[PDB]
Structure formats: C-alpha cells, structure tokens
Design a protein around this ligand. Sequence first.
Ligand SMILES: Nc1ncnc2c1ncn2[C@@H]1O[C@H](COP(=O)(O)O)[C@@H](O)[C@H]1O
Ligand SMILES: Nc1ncnc2c1ncn2[C@@H]1O[C@H](COP(=O)(O)O)[C@@H](O)[C@H]1O
Ligand SMILES: [Fe+3]
Ligand SMILES: [Fe+3]
Ligand SMILES: [Fe+3]
Ligand SMILES: [Fe+3]
Lengths: 194, 194
Amino acid sequence: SYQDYINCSREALLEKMAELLPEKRLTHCLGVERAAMELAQRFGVDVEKASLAGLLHDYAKKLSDQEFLVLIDRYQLDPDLKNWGNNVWHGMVGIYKIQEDLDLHDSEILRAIEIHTVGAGQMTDLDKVIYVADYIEHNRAFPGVDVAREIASLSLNKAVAYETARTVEYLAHQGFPIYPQTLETYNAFVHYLK
Amino acid sequence: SYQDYINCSREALLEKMAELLPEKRLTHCLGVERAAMELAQRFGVDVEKASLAGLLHDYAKKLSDQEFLVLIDRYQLDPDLKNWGNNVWHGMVGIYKIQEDLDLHDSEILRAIEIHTVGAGQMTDLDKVIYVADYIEHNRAFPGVDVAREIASLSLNKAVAYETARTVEYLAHQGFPIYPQTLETYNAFVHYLK
Ligand SMILES: Nc1ncnc2c1ncn2[C@@H]1O[C@H](COP(=O)(O)O)[C@@H](O)[C@H]1O
Ligand SMILES: Nc1ncnc2c1ncn2[C@@H]1O[C@H](COP(=O)(O)O)[C@@H](O)[C@H]1O
Ligand SMILES: [Fe+3]
Ligand SMILES: [Fe+3]
Ligand SMILES: [Fe+3]
Ligand SMILES: [Fe+3]
C-alpha cells in the first residue's frame, strides 16, 4: 500500500492533493498514476513505486516562487536554481516539500519525481516510466500524443528520446531558456530515435 | 590588406581555396566575406578583420575525420571533441589548419572562425558578425532567411538569438546531437528575442 512509503492513505493523499491543486492538475496526476502503472508492468518496474511517483509527480506544481527559493536555501541546493522557474523547480525542488508533507524517504521515487521534467543523462527505468507516463497519460491530447503512445508501447528508451526531442524543439520554437540538464537527457537518448 | 594577417594575397588565397573546396562552398565563403563586411560597417567592427574571417570561416570544411583527429591530439584539445564530427570540428579544430597553412595568428579572427558554428555564451562583436554573416549571406535561400536578414539589419544580438534558436529547433526536429556549447549560446542570447 501507499502507507508503505508515505504517512497517509491513498484516499487521504487524494483529499490533501485536491486542496493543493486545481481539478485539471489533479486529474492529470491520476492520469499519470494509471499510465505509470501500465508502463511499469510492460517494462519490469515495481508497479506500486511507479503509481505513487506518478500521482505525486506534480504535487508541488503550485508552490510559490517564494517557497521554492526558501527551499533552495534550507536544503542548500545548487545556487544556479535561483536563475530558473517553476518548470525546473516543481520536480527538482518540489521533492523537498513532498518529503516534508508526506514523510517520503524512498530514494527511487524521490529521484523519479526529481527529474520528471528535465530527465538526466542516466535514468533508472522507474525514472523513465514517470518521465514518459507524464507525457502520454490519457487526458493529454497535444498533436503527436498518438505517436508518443505507439513508441511507449514498444520502447521506453525511444519514448524518452522522442519526448525529449519534442520538448527541446518546442522550447527553441517558443524562444524559452532550456535547462542544461535537459540537453544532457537529449544527447544521451537521441541515438534511440534511429 | 590580407597580407597584414596571412602569408599570401587575397588572390593567392582564393586560388588556394578553390583547390580545397567545391564551387558551392567557395561561393558561400565569398558570400560571407561580403556579408561580414556590411555587418562590420553597421555594428562598428573592423571591416577587414570581418571580411577575412568571413572568407576563411569554412576553409577547413573538407578536412577528413582523420586529419581532425590528428589535430585534436597534436594541439591537445578537449578529448570530448573525438565524440563529435565535422559540424563541430571545421571551426573548433579547423582553426589549427588555417594557422598552419596561412600563418594566421590574430586571436580575434581565430576566435571568430573557432566558434562560427556553435557560438559561445560570451561573443565579441566580431564573433557575432561572422556567426550571423554565415547565416544571411546572399547565396542562402532557406525559408526564413528574409526574417534573419531584417533582424540583422537592426540588431546583431537579436540576429544571434534568432539564428541559434532556429538551429537548436532544427537539430531537435532532425534528431541530431546538439553540441553543449550551442546551448550555452542559446541561453545567453535567447532573452534578445523579446
Ligand atoms: N529544460 C527545460 N527548461 C525549461 N522548461 C522545460 C524544460 N524541459 C521541460 N520544460 C517545460 O516545463 C513544463 C512542465 O513540464 P512537465 O513537468 O513535463 O509537465 C513544460 O511546459 C515543459 O515544456
Ligand atoms: N551544436 C551543434 N551540434 C551539431 N551540429 C550543429 C550545432 N550547431 C550547428 N550545427 C550544424 O552544423 C552545420 C554547419 O553549420 P555552419 O558552420 O553554421 O554552416 C549545420 O548543418 C548546423 O545545423
Ligand atoms: Fe511536472
Ligand atoms: Fe505532469
Ligand atoms: Fe561552417
Ligand atoms: Fe559557412
């Protein structure tokens, strides 16, 4: 059960999360919970760790800038993080909030949530499941989600590669800064597209 | 004159370059020579340094992999360079060939050619002129070259930002690895797009 990892039940979590997040964000988290489960089954990942990471992944999505900044200092994280924003922080810093609120200490789940947005050059299979589940969960309908879904049905590595290539492409298309760890992911996984 | 910087005349250079490169690549270099001159005038860069860098920028475009690898060892360059290819090498490594063949020692011209493909987080105005001239020279006709040209008529910084955003976008669109120094450029210049 989830109580094996956090300090409350799935139901109590859901109640807590419904306070912290708007409907759409919570529905998305439930989406990722389900998608992570199906991917974990297909690729030999502990389904329960995947489900819980999936549900928790955007837990900290609505922390203010101020709170993230507070968290950066308190946990003495990379000072460069202050030069960034919510996109980077909700996973990379938001893990400290999750740890505070829910007494989550499992290093594998924490890592999966940590790098769900930006990935890393080295990802565990759990990491990859969350990173992909987030992209392909059943409520998303961006153009090309069907291609992501087909790729994720066959290869987790190729799904990571595809998602990261489309993110780098969209960020550059939009003229947004690209967190350098995302490029690390991109360059590690890009060979899989072939 | 060019003899102020290299060991032969412009004419003798052109003869030498016509041997080293196919017509299209040489025509391109002449294109960049002219474009660099016009940009140097507009933005307060020494027109002669700009012209010469522009003409020399793709001098080493057809060195073999083997020669680049030879050059990496001899000049004891970043060993990571071996993990890459022509795109990165012709500027970043090709400067050593140019120095060998033409006795070019001016640090400013060398730097401009060095990073003409990938840029850097810090670029001199000469660097920027070459980086942009390469993109907008009169023989290019890629879709959007007209937008690049208009931007380069008004702002060198914005021209750098635009070119780099389109390169990052195209590399990700194509599924090619992205040399991490290119992202350095992208993230330094991207604010200029606003
Ligand atoms: N390296 C990055 N730098 C900045 N934003 C990013 C990066 N990678 C992903 N994002 C964006 O962060 C937002 C949240 O992503 P996600 O956590 O995957 O839903 C999305 O709009 C992504 O485009
Ligand atoms: N960071 C990079 N990594 C790999 N290739 C690149 C990078 N930046 C530019 N290129 C490519 O290298 C080629 C030569 O570029 P240029 O020297 O600007 O004509 C072009 O096809 C560019 O798309
Ligand atoms: Fe997220
Ligand atoms: Fe999400
Ligand atoms: Fe070039
Ligand atoms: Fe060129």
